[PDB]
């Protein structure tokens, strides 16, 4: 449980759509700007889902 | 200032004073005929250790020019975290593209 | 401000007042040396009990900042409706996209 409530959630821009691609859009939480060590959305990217 | 066509000019400071891009050109534009009048005093294979230490340090130069382009090196494996008595340590499988817009 | 290298420092209010994003880097910048001069009064197993109650209370604070992003949560299952003698209690298969433009 200590690494399920442990993630990087960027705030959405006012008037922008939802981020769908982790590769291009930096507001996506699985983007390589957000893939920190010891976290689970990077573990969403280590094990790619 | 190193000169490649002689054995006893290359030192550690002579390799790292030129970067990665310039070392592509000057080694592809050097002299064919090797001089042998005064060789390297630690032998002609001793300078082989002397040059190539400056190459893996030359991408630490390119790591700095792309420190505004790549990411900080996260620990690739577990066991590396300040707190291990309440939280575990992951390690990032660095399949991602080090790429900052 | 809690110190993660001391078990007798972390309370529920120290974790909740710190943000969820600020809770990430504060746990990664702690000390590798674990101090045993002042343990937690409920034991070392009790310090694990105190720390994680502040994280789940911070998920409720995260739902407040994202209340303009999702909607009001509908009742999921049977048996819960105001007027049950003329219409039943509905429940959503929550597979939609909770998103406010």
Please identify which residue in the block is written with the tokens 């699985």. Answer: A30
Way the structure was solved: cryo-EM
Closest CA to A7 of B70, C66, B98: C66
Do B54 and B12 form a contact (C-beta atoms < 8 A)?
yes
Q: C20 touching A, CB under 8 A?
A: yes
Instruction: Find the CB nearest B82 among C30, C47, C48.
Output: C30
What is the end-to-end Cα distance of chain B in Å, rounded? 37
| Chain B residues with CB-CB distance to C44 below 8 A | 85
Distance separating alpha carbons of residues A25 and A17, to the nearest angstrom: 11
Instruction: Find the CB nearest B96 among A3, A26, A45.
Output: A45
What are the structure tokens assigned to A18, written together? 């939802």
Instruction: Find the CB nearest B82 among C29, C44, C51.
Output: C29
Distance separating alpha carbons of residues A30 and A40, to the nearest angstrom: 9
Do C44 and C10 form a contact (C-beta atoms < 8 A)?
no
Closest CA to B100 of B72, B70, B74, B58: B70
| Chain B residues with CB-CB distance to A36 below 8 A | 74
Nearest Cα of chain A lies from the Cα of C58 at a distance, in angstroms, of 9
B93: which residues sit within 8 A by CB, 6+ positions away? A46, A47, B76
| Burial bucket for residue B101 (CB in 10 Å: 0-12, 13-18, 19+) | exposed
What are the structure tokens assigned to C23, written together? 């809770």
Distance separating alpha carbons of residues B2 and B17, to the nearest angstrom: 9
CB atoms C31 and B82 under 8 Å: yes
> Helix, strand or coil for residue C83?
coil
Distance separating alpha carbons of residues B83 and A38, to the nearest angstrom: 11
Please identify which residue in the block is written with the tokens 């009790």. Answer: C46
CB atoms B75 and A37 under 8 Å: yes
Distance separating alpha carbons of residues A21 and A7, to the nearest angstrom: 17
Q: Quick one: angle between helices B20-28 and B58-65, nearest 10?
A: 130
C24: which residues sit within 8 A by CB, 6+ positions away? A6, A8, A36, A39
CB atoms B96 and A32 under 8 Å: yes
Neighbours of chain B (3+ CB pairs under 8 A): A, C
What are the structure tokens assigned to B19, written together? 């970067």
Nearest Cα of chain C lies from the Cα of A6 at a distance, in angstroms, of 7
Cα separation values, A11 from A15, B36, C25, Å: 12, 67, 18
Do C51 and C10 form a contact (C-beta atoms < 8 A)?
yes
Residue of A nearest to C66 (CA): A11
CB neighbourhood size of C51 (10 A): 23
């Amino acid at each position: 449980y200590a690494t399920l409530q442990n993630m990087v959630v960027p705030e959405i821009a006012p008037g922008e759509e939802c981020p769908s691609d982790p590769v291009t859009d930096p507001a996506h939480p699985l983007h390589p700007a957000n893939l920190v060590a010891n976290t689970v959305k990077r573990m969403f990217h280590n094990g790619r889902v | 200032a190193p000169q490649f066509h002689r054995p006893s000019t290359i030192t550690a400071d002579n390799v790292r004073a030129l970067g990665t891009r310039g070392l592509v050109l000057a080694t592809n534009n050097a002299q064919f005929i090797m001089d042998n009048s005064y060789p390297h005093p630690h032998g002609t294979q001793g300078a082989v250790r002397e040059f190539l230490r400056g190459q893996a340090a030359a991408l630490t130069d390119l790591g700095v020019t792309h420190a505004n382009n790549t990411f900080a090196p996260q620990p690739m494996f577990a066991g590396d975290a300040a707190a291990e008595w309440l939280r575990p340590s992951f390690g990032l499988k660095r399949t991602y593209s080090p790429f900052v817009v």
